[PDB]
Design a protein around this nucleic acid. Structure first.
Ligand code: DCT
Length: 463
RNA sequence: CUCCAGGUCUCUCGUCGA
RNA sequence: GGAGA
């Protein structure tokens, strides 16, 4: 990922974009009961907690690119992953517009509560001015698409969210890229059946966890990844993808039946253009976080990436015995033999990728089923039914969430949802949690689910 | 006097119906 | 800046 060019938006006929600088996160009634290290992310240059240049820091994610060709490893990598995807009958036929916009089995409708992006964001137009789920109208949509076209700039905002205290101090707030309604629709039309087949089939064939429910799915995972575990973390994956990985992705899209016409939408992702406040700029490489397809294409690329590193580092390796599940940058995998992920990291570095030891730390340790995480959840088998596995979100991360709110009107929903995460920590931990919640006047006013009821419904789901 | 801040997945709750 | 009660 690299910013090639910056220009004034006026110069390029673009309006200045209103980008919020005030967080919506307030300390909650539970802010004191529990301990936490996160505060809301820095959103402006005048933040008193800033110990570094803000605008320098938020964009620092664009580490650079590496100029390499699609090498013999990538190519093999692609043919292998493609051969899996071929077993699924991914239709390259464009999705019916009513389905691409207002949802179908395997693909939910557009988020109508979010920005419509450029140009509408500066015309003061909301998604709901153009769409209604209730009416399923496409009239105003086609109109707007005719008028404004495709490949519009993506609008860059800072994400309102909690960050570690060093990420607050270092200004490493996160950027997202608001994709225009038009582009989201066009991509969903073009790639809807791919999205759908992916969501309806998470596992070791797609190599994707997208569409799974950790409650039900954690039990399936150790069966699928029966070998020795492989797991690492990425630093700024999305921003680290050089163009060659996109070339790889286009090539696998081509294998699947996609025309050069349709693969060209990948070009709008790799080579993208953005609005940020009063500037218009160009990024070469990097997956733009916020485009349509970001989870699916990030994941497909990860399947190509890890396959490549293996084929490269361990020359003569049998990928028919390799198994991986990716969720964007997040990956859990296994191979029948011990693989040194520090070496896969060294290789990764040569392709622009920064891979680090899993779940923080400074050794590429053994990855056991004990310490491995996926989607931030640990794996624990039931003590009573050892083939059912618990997705275990650390209580410390649940704690971080409850200590804040964006609106106390939601405290009941918020806490209930937190409960459905916490209980997989066990009865001891859940009741301590329910106690600490109850240790505060407002906590005594909430309907909390009983552990016994949670465990019951869970066991009941496997039926 | 409010609103402006992306893609998605999962779950949950609210309302309305068979 | 724009949209609205
Ligand atoms: N609002 C968000 C937050 C995250 N993500 C996706 C894109 C990248 C992926 C990883 O994000 P995190 O791991 O949660 O961020 P981090 O580990 O703190 O920072 P980094 O991406 O540098 O590892 O999640 C997203 O699409 N939208």
């Amino acid at each position: 990922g690299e910013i090639e060019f910056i220009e004034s938006s006026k110069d390029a006929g673009f309006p200045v974009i209103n980008t919020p600088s005030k967080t919506k996160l307030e300390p909650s009634v539970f802010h004191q009961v529990f301990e936490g290290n996160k505060e809301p992310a820095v959103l402006r240059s005048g933040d008193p907690r800033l110990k570094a240049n803000f605008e320098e820091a938020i964009f620092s994610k664009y580490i650079g690119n590496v100029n390499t060709h699609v090498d013999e490893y990538m190519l093999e990598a692609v043919d292998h992953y493609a051969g899996q995807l071929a077993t699924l009958d991914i239709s390259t036929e464009p999705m019916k517009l009513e389905d691409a916009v207002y949802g179908t089995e395997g693909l939910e409708a557009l988020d109508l509560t979010t920005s419509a992006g450029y140009p509408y964001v500066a015309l003061g137009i909301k998604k709901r001015d153009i769409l209604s789920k209730k009416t399923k109208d496409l009239t105003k949509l086609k109109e707007c698409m005719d008028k404004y076209g495709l490949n519009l700039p993506m609008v860059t905002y800072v994400k309102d969210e909690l960050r570690s205290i060093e990420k607050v101090a270092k200004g490493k707030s996160r950027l997202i890229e608001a994709s225009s309604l038009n582009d989201s629709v066009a991509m969903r039309q073009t790639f809807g059946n791919l999205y759908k087949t992916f969501h309806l089939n998470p596992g070791v064939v797609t190599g994707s966890a997208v569409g799974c429910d950790p409650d039900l799915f954690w039990s399936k995972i150790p069966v699928m990844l029966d070998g020795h575990l492989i797991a690492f973390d990425y630093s700024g994956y999305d921003a680290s993808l050089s163009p060659v990985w996109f070339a790889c992705l286009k090539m696998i899209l081509e294998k699947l039946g996609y025309t050069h016409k349709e693969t060209n939408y990948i070009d709008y992702l790799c080579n993208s253009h953005h609005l940020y406040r009063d500037k218009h700029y160009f990024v070469r490489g990097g997956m733009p976080s916020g485009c349509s397809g970001t989870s699916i294409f990030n994941s497909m690329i990860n399947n190509i990436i890890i396959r490549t590193l293996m084929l490269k580092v361990y020359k003569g390796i049998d990928l028919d015995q390799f198994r991986m599940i990716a969720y964007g940058d997040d990956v859990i995998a296994s191979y029948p033999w011990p693989i040194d992920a520090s070496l896969l990291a060294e290789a990764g570095k040569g392709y622009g990728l920064i891979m680090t030891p899993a779940d923080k730390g400074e050794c590429f340790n053994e990855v056991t089923w004990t310490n491995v995480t996926f989607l931030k959840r640990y794996f624990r088998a039931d003590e009573q039914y050892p083939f059912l596995v618990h997705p275990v979100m650390p209580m410390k991360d649940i704690h971080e969430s409850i200590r804040w709110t964006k609106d106390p009107k939601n405290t009941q929903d918020h806490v209930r949802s937190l409960c459905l995460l916490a209980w997989h920590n066990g009865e001891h931990e859940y009741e301590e949690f329910i106690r600490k919640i109850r240790s505060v006047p407002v906590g005594r006013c909430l309907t909390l689910p009983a552990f016994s009821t949670l465990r019951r419904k869970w066991l009941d789901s496997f039926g």
